[PDB]
Paper text:
Here we report the discovery of type IV borosin natural product pathways (termed ‘split borosins’), featuring an iteratively acting α-N-methyltransferase and separate precursor peptide substrate from the metal-respiring bacterium [name]. The α-N-methyltransferase [name] from [name] MR-1 iteratively methylates its substrate [name] at two residues, [name]-L63 and [name]-I65, in an N-to-C terminal fashion on the core peptide. A five helical bundle at the N-terminus of [name], now referred to as the borosin binding domain (BBD; 1–53), serves as the [name] leader peptide and is homologous to a portion of the fused clasp region of OphMA.
Mutation of [name]-[name] produced an inactive enzyme, that when co-crystallized with [name] and SAH, was at once unable to maintain normal contacts with the top clamp, while still binding the cofactor in a manner that allowed the bottom lock to close. In fact, the structure captures an intermediate conformation between the observed closed conformations (e.g., apo or SAH-bound wt structures) and the open conformation of the [name]—[name]-BBD heterodimer. Concomitantly, helix 5 of the BBD (2.5 turns; as observed in the wt structure) is entirely unwound in the [name]-[name]—[name]-0Me—SAH complex. Comparison between the wt [name]—[name]-2Me—SAH and the [name]-[name]—[name]-0Me—SAH complexes highlights the extent of the change and reveals that unwinding of the BBD’s helix 5 appears necessary to allow the longer section of the core peptide ([name] 53–71 of [name]-[name]—[name]-0Me—SAH vs. [name] 62–71 of wt) to enter the active site in the form of an α-helix. In contrast to all previously described structures, the [name]-[name]—[name]-0Me—SAH structure is not a post-reaction complex. We note that the structure is a pre-reaction complex but is not in a productive conformation: the closest core peptide backbone NH group to the sulfur atom of SAH is “i−9” (6.4 Å). However, the [name]-[name]—[name]-0Me—SAH structure suggests [name]-R67 is critical for the top clamp conformation, core peptide configuration, and the positioning of the complex into productive modes.
Numbering used by the authors:
A (entry chain A), B (entry chain C): 2 to 263
C (entry chain B): 0 to 70
D (entry chain D): -1 to 70
The structure:
Amino acid sequence: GSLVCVGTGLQLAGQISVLSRSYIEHADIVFSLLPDGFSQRWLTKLNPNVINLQQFYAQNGEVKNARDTYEQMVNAILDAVRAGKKTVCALYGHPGVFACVSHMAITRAKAEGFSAKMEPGISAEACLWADLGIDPGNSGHQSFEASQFMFFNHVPDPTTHLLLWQIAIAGEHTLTQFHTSSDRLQILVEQLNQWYPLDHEVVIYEAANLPIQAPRIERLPLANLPQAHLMPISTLLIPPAKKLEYNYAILAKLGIGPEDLG
Amino acid sequence: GSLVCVGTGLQLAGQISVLSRSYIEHADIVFSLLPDGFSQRWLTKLNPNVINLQQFYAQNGEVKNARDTYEQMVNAILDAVRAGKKTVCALYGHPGVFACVSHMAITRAKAEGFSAKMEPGISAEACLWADLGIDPGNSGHQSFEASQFMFFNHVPDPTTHLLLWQIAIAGEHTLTQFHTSSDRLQILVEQLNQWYPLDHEVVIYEAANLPIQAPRIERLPLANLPQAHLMPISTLLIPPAKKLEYNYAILAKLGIGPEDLG
Amino acid sequence: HMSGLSDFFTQLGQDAQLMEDYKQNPEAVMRAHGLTDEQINAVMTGDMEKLKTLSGDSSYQSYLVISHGNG
Amino acid sequence: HHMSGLSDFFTQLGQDAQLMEDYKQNPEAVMRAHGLTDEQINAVMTGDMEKLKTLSGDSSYQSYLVISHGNG
Ligand SMILES: Nc1ncnc2c1ncn2[C@@H]1O[C@H](CSCC[C@H](N)C(=O)O)[C@@H](O)[C@H]1O
Ligand SMILES: Nc1ncnc2c1ncn2[C@@H]1O[C@H](CSCC[C@H](N)C(=O)O)[C@@H](O)[C@H]1O
């Protein structure tokens, strides 16, 4: 058969593509990874033949690797494809943005010589730009996984709008639980304080999943981050700490004088 | 009156969000900045009450202040709102990603006491991740306007997927009119060589605008970029030039070592 | 109870006309969509079960760590 | 007629996954099946529709960013 991975956006029902909605209607079987029961109910009304992929996350009494969690999810998706089924995976937001199951399933389906593609969806950052009235192109944009930013060497350009994703579990590890989330966020604040003042206004952003609720747009000084209540759906926005400065080296090459830049 | 700015995505008719489509359907008047006739025809059949904003771009040659162009676009939008009309402003892709008109119109509508908001849409960024099966979260993601990267001081993180938008007009200026465009891209190539070797594989990406066309995914050595044929719709993807390295200082603060990661 | 809420929330998130009418008079618009006084109140106050499900943040975070920690 | 026929078809094809799967199977047959002429089918199959008048407003956007950060 075939595999199409689609995003449903973040808002219930309205934030999906006309085309992506069409793929779900006509799918023989749908594998879902949605964040709440309302969007699970909405999907099931679109196409009754839904398999819910979060049964593959560690349940009560289990400890499960990310490797085995995803392997089991991909295997289940690939079984329906192997059975000659027109299979559609329905993920929230964009199925390939800060998510690897869909990329993994598509890689494996092609390897076995089946037709597999990804349809772009409206991700959390796409929602952020709209809700905060910020243009990522204005002074540029950087996105990092919060924990990756702590464990590995990422040097941010503080002229840009910086997004730290999965901020709630920043630095989390079964060996770093002697530190509280507040303790880990304090360590992250010390690290960010290398480029950003402790009084630098940051924004805790949570796009609305329902049409009856406003998004969370909590502005606060960087120093107060460790005391913030954070959810699995929290994204941290760190606006620019620095104005853009002319690149005098490259202007000189081009033959432009800074006063000739309007 | 009210204002709602929506994006139609990059693919004709199918990449618009179900709710964004409905806002267009129900709008008393629609101001469009769609790039081509096919999307203009599609919009027209959805809602005949369309005013083209493309008229406000410099018409008799090329000596207009961009701030004036956008000032007039915003003014034409607000005049429909000021007349108590349900106004919708339809942009391609995401109305707020590497575009300023919608943010400007919404800012000034809000400031004049009118209900104004932006509905997220599917941007060229979002199509790139799907079409190239790349996760921006994998090693992080950076987006810069190519010309802003040349004229101003940006530091790329070569562990990340780096996007240079509007790559075709990299370094365009009245003072660089007589530059041959390969000359301009050669300077960009030299600049980038601080972080990226000359044989480093880069990708010229163009998301399909029509359902009968496949995307352009052109792989080539960074060194050959000045010889490349580039379109206004071309985006340059620069994959990582470096593996992620362990942040030993932050790891020690957390009480774990590299060996604990994996 | 939640079956009616779910069906009303789906329409509201899809219809631009319903979204506007709702903004103007949410109570009256919910009455007209056959929603109980219990349900109206729960929506107006924000005191209503969100039906949040197990997020995969920890599995995605851990997978990213295991991927670049193999070198 | 020529351009109206292509626009209606493209619009349908871009919105319907069923139709889009068929079009990938038999492009000529599906287009022929939707009342498109051989001239229309020819414009599509190894022909035009791309590289035709577009206006993405990149110049005015790059200039705006330059003068708004030009601090002059
Ligand atoms: N409602 C929401 N508001 C803000 N960020 C959100 C969000 N839902 C998910 N996220 C972000 O996404 C992370 C989970 S990873 C999945 C992201 C999803 N593919 C997307 O396209 O958005 C969260 O930790 C958070 O950083
Ligand atoms: N079809 C396409 N494929 C790839 N990149 C594209 C594109 N159309 C526009 N772009 C990118 O966007 C720039 C124009 S700025 C407008 C961007 C639009 N708001 C969006 O959401 O995508 C181009 O110079 C290019 O970098």
